[PDB]
């Protein structure tokens, strides 16, 4: 759902 940060 964002993933890498």
């Amino acid at each position, epitope marked *: *759902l*964002k*993933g890498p*940060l």
Partner: antibody
Framework: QDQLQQSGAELVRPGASVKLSCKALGYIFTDYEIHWVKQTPVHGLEWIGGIHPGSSGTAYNQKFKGKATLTADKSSTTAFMELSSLTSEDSAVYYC?????WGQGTLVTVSA | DIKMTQSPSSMYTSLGERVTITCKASQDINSFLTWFLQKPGKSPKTLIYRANRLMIGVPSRFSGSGSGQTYSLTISSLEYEDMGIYYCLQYDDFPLTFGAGTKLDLKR
């Protein structure tokens, strides 16, 4: 897709430590970040930090860096959050979240 | 730190009514935005994610639009079980930031 399962309510003494746990069920534990969120009637909701169990990389709110340690264990699909040097101000409801799912929260009561 | 400005902060509503709740971001969040609801002494429950995707299990009564800075949650006809506090959450950047909350009650 299923759930996050959080440890039980904790009653601790000022200046002690607390390790909370977040069990991930029914989804691939290594594909999603787990994020920990603090809630209290004075501050509202605030983000502590997050962990990627795949890479093992973490991101922290600057306010909790040095206080809170985020780790994950692949073999038990459990994320943990350690809180040190506790004070009355750490009294709150702590949640793990996947951004879509939410565990049920652990109540942490710091008191003498 | 991206600011989330949720308004209104409390609303007096009738069952049956259509409500709209909003979040402005201080910078373009690229639709990375969730909408969730909290009931007294209860863990949050997500309704929408990515600005408009409904969540498996959520009545079709809920709907969310927006892009850029201004995001919105509409409840087409209010039901008794809809009452609680509504939050919004940006996850475009760290740190994650939330809105102050939007409290709904029945007018009388």
């Amino acid at each position: 897709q299923d759930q996050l399962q959080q440890s039980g309510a904790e009653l601790v003494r000022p200046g002690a430590s607390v390790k909370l746990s977040c069990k991930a069920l029914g989804y691939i534990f290594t594909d999603y970040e787990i994020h920990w969120v603090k809630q209290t009637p004075v501050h509202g909701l605030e983000w502590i930090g997050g962990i990627h169990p795949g890479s093992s990389g973490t991101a922290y709110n600057q306010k909790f860096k040095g206080k809170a340690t985020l780790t994950a264990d692949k073999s038990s699909t459990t994320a943990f959050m350690e809180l040190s040097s506790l004070t009355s101000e750490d009294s709150a409801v702590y949640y793990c979240t996947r951004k879509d799912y939410w565990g049920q929260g652990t109540l942490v009561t710091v008191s003498a | 730190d991206i600011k989330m400005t949720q308004s209104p902060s409390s609303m007096y509503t009738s069952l049956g009514e259509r409500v709209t709740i909003t979040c402005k971001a201080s910078q373009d969040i690229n639709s990375f935005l969730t909408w969730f609801l909290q009931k007294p002494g209860k863990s949050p429950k997500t309704l929408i994610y990515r600005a408009n995707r409904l969540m498996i299990g959520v009545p079709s009564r809920f709907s969310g639009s927006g892009s850029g800075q201004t995001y919105s949650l509409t409840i087409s006809s209010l039901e008794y079980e809809d009452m609680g506090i509504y939050y919004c959450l940006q996850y475009d950047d760290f740190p994650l930031t939330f809105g102050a909350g939007t409290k709904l009650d029945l007018k009388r």
